[PDB]
């Protein structure tokens, strides 16, 4: 039926699919490096290193296919919260997207190694050669971030990741398949294409729908101008699968081909000295330039719905590629051969390959893509939100990243006035879909209104007002006792024998338990922390009804207690210890608006690092932030904590020190240029995610949407008006909350009315 074209048979090792004719294969999932983050200077170096690592493993056995598959991603699912405010935010932000691109690029490289008690040892030799080739390629692609596709057991049904890509090549829709005892050629196809016998266009046959696709063959010989030439296709309104193959030629074969070409060009009736000398230069450039040639066909298979729409897509692609000095030749009768040539190891069905230098293959497919992140499959459900980007590609933001268990710590370096608090509120509100506990810490009441809207119990603090804290009412567990001992020592230090006294006193010492009572059991120094003393309002309170079970979110404001070196370390130990006691099983998070002040704590920093090592496998997501990096890098330990971070988000800070971004944060010089390029209040930010970056331009201004066939204008101006927090905003919120009650959504309309009156 259809297996007459598909060569795949079965697995030979976890990461190497075999072939019918014994042509072992491997599949790599290449994320690709961003071609916007780095200037034109480093692109050439990228191409050169890829050339080096290719010619390093050059052999006549090897080959390479390369595919740039574009999708209209549907695997990003809508999520329903349990709070009306977050639902409002999500609904308007999603409605901000009617008419956008919503397309992701995926880049796949496949390496196939076809050989040209001896038999068993040769089987072992073949697989060992291919695995060594894989190791070298992996060493090469470290910056690009590729992952080796390998089997993954799903509940006793072993599967095989490489089959999925080869399926998408033919099926056109990601249909998972299991590894089973057949030869995969029989059932790897599910939705078999139906090419019109004249061959201008095609068809697809799915359970849920169908499509039409016409092709283009990009046969180019001239050396490319840009190291990525036809990358204009990476941004277009149509789907495609752009395919290149590099069936290498053994060095004598390349020499012979160049010699025959030069001879047949000489033995003609017209002399063209613009060609003969160039070819003769290349012939002994091959020996001394060290690049190995090979076969190469290029085919672009645009998809569509209406056949006329497919022709419009082809005309648009032809124009947009004539703009880059390449002439597309439409395919009319070769379409069946072209499409069945997309499958790796289908050398036979290539329409008309012609030898191409290695530099030109790596410069036609250099693995450039606009950074877009993972739409789904993350360790924490789908991506939290879908940021826009300059040049129109949807960045699917997430703290997951990949290998800076899964590292999730995130830092948000930028000025607080310039959209830091708005961004943090937006991210937390739209990441409420996970239902994780958020332990918010704040500076200058940044997030009070946002947290109180999200159904937390944000506790505003205040100097001289009873804090309500009473650590001595903790249950007398071994851990709490140790803490209290350390805690009281720290209080006493504000003013070995002392230690013994404190220990005996704490051991000896529920409703009656207070710091003042402790004095009855160092005494003179603790008096100031007791009722009637300078700090008696903090820890000597009669009661302490403060456990994390009642709510999911809590926020603690220490902007009152920020720059007062007496007891930041005590209060931070207490908050961290009590919150850490709650850390089991629950999907967990921290938020630190500013951390460098608690960072210079001697006792707390070691505990933080050890707890980090313990938590990295326990769904821990720190979300650090800083108003200006020079504040952070002033402290040495801050560099140690910054080295352990997953995703960096960079706001617009014109007043940015060169050294800090350049070597402190492992940024590039070009990225440092892009940071300064943003205006004072640009509302864009460069997200260095892993080892690739893009300008995630977020804009919550006026937008047009279609409701019931009419264009209506809407906005998020209101949301950012309620999202950000100001002291007048805080006092209005406190007055309302005091008078109306507790429930989150009962007061919000009243708040809207009062804030509207303030704005007038």
């Amino acid at each position: 039926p259809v297996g007459q074209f598909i060569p795949y048979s079965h697995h030979v090792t976890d990461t190497i699919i075999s072939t019918k004719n014994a042509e072992y294969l491997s599949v790599w999932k290449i994320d690709g490096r961003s071609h916007q983050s780095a200037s034109e200077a480093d692109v050439f170096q990228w191409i050169r290193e890829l050339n080096n690592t290719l010619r390093g493993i050059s052999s006549a056995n090897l080959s390479l296919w390369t595919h740039i598959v574009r999708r209209r991603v549907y695997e990003y699912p809508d999520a329903e919260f349990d709070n009306v405010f977050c639902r409002q935010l999500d609904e308007k932000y999603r409605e901000s997207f009617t008419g956008y691109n919503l397309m992701v690029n995926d880049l796949y490289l496949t390496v196939v190694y076809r050989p040209v008690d001896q038999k068993k040892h040769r089987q072992e030799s073949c697989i060992k050669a291919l695995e060594d080739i894989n190791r070298t390629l992996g060493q090469s692609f470290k910056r690009y971030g590729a992952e080796l596709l390998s089997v993954y057991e799903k509940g006793g049904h072993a599967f095989s990741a490489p089959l999925e890509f080869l399926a998408r090549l033919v099926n056109g829709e990601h249909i998972p398949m299991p590894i089973c005892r057949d030869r995969f050629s029989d059932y790897m196809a599910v939705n078999r294409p139906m090419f019109s016998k004249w061959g201008e266009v095609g068809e697809l046959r799915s359970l849920t729908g169908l499509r039409r696709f016409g092709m283009l063959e990009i046969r180019e010989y001239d050396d490319a101008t840009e190291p990525g030439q036809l990358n204009v296709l990476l941004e277009s309104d149509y789907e495609f699968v752009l395919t290149h193959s590099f069936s290498v030629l053994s060095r004598p074969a390349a020499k012979e081909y160049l010699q025959r070409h030069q001879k047949n060009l000489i033995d003609a009736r017209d002399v063209a000295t613009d060609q003969i000398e160039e070819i003769d230069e290349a012939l002994n450039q091959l020996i001394s330039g060290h690049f190995v040639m090979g076969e190469h066909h290029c085919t672009l298979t645009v998809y569509g719905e209406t056949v006329q729409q497919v022709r419009d897509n082809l005309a648009h692609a032809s124009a947009a590629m004539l703009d880059v000095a390449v002439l597309p030749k439409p395919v009319d009768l070769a379409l069946e051969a072209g499409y069945w040539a997309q499958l790796p190891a289908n050398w036979q069905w290539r329409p008309r390959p012609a030898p191409i230098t290695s530099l030109n293959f790596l410069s036609f497919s250099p693995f450039h893509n606009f950074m877009s992140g993972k739409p789904t499959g993350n360790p924490w459900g789908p991506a939290v939100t879908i940021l826009k980007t300059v040049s129109g590609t949807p960045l699917y933001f997430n703290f997951h990243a990949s290998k800076e268990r899964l590292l999730g710590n995130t830092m948000l370096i930028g000025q607080s006035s310039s959209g830091k608090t708005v961004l943090l509120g937006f991210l937390l509100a739209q990441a409420q879909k996970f239902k994780p506990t958020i332990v918010a810490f704040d500076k200058d009441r940044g997030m009070e209104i946002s947290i109180r809207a999200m159904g937390g119990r944000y506790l505003p603090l205040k100097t001289g007002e009873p804090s309500g804290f009473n650590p001595f009412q903790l249950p007398p567990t071994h851990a709490n006792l140790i803490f209290l001992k350390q805690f009281v020592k720290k209080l006493a230090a504000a003013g070995h024998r002392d230690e013994e006294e404190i220990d005996q006193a704490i051991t000896a010492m529920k409703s009656l338990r207070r710091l003042s009572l402790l004095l009855q059991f160092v005494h003179a120094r603790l008096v100031k922390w007791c009722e009637g003393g300078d700090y008696g309002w903090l820890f000597d309170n009669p009661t302490d009804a403060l456990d994390l079970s009642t709510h999911q979110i809590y926020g603690f404001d220490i902007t009152e207690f920020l720059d007062n070196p007496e007891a930041r370390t005590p209060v931070m130990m207490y908050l961290l210890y009590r919150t850490e006691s709650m850390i089991d099983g629950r999907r967990f998070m921290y938020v630190f608006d500013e951390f460098w002040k608690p960072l210079q704590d001697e006792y707390f920093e070691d505990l933080a690092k050890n707890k980090q090592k313990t938590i990295r496998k326990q769904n821990g997501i720190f979300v650090f932030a800083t108003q200006e990096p020079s504040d952070a890098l002033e402290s040495n330990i801050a560099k140690t904590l910054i080295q352990q971070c997953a995703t960096y988000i960079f706001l617009a800070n014109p007043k940015a020190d060169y050294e800090d971004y350049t070597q402190g944060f492992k940024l590039t010089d070009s990225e440092f240029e892009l940071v300064r390029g943003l205006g004072e209040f640009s509302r864009r930010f460069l997200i260095k995610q892993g080892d690739q970056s893009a300008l995630a331009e977020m804009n919550l201004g006026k937008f047009r949407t279609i409701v019931d066939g009419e264009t209506v204008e809407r906005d998020f101006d209101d949301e950012l008006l309620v999202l950000s927090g100001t002291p007048d905003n805080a006092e209005i919120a406190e007055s309302i909350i005091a008078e109306v009650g507790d429930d989150p959504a009962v007061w919000l309309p009243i708040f809207l009315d009062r804030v509207k009156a303030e704005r007038s």
Binding site: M194, S196, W198, E200, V201, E203, R212, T306, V307
Partner: peptide, 30 residues
Amino acid sequence: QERIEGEYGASELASERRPHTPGARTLLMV
């Protein structure tokens, strides 16, 4: 299994026919 809708099939030129001068047949036969 049928020709794919809305594509360029065979030519529309095969429909052409050579016209006969409407006296050639009768007098040629006689």
